[PDB]
Symmetry: C2
Subunit: 21 residues, 2 copies
């Protein structure tokens, strides 16, 4: 995923899925 | 977690973690 600088209004529903969970 | 009716502005950073991942 690309990220919204330190999780914010747009980073996980996406990211803390396959990186680490 | 409690949820924001079908994921929205508030349901995963939290939920698609320990339920299913």
């Amino acid at each position: 995923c690309s990220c919204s600088s330190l999780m914010d209004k747009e980073c996980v529903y996406f990211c803390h899925l396959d990186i680490i969970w």
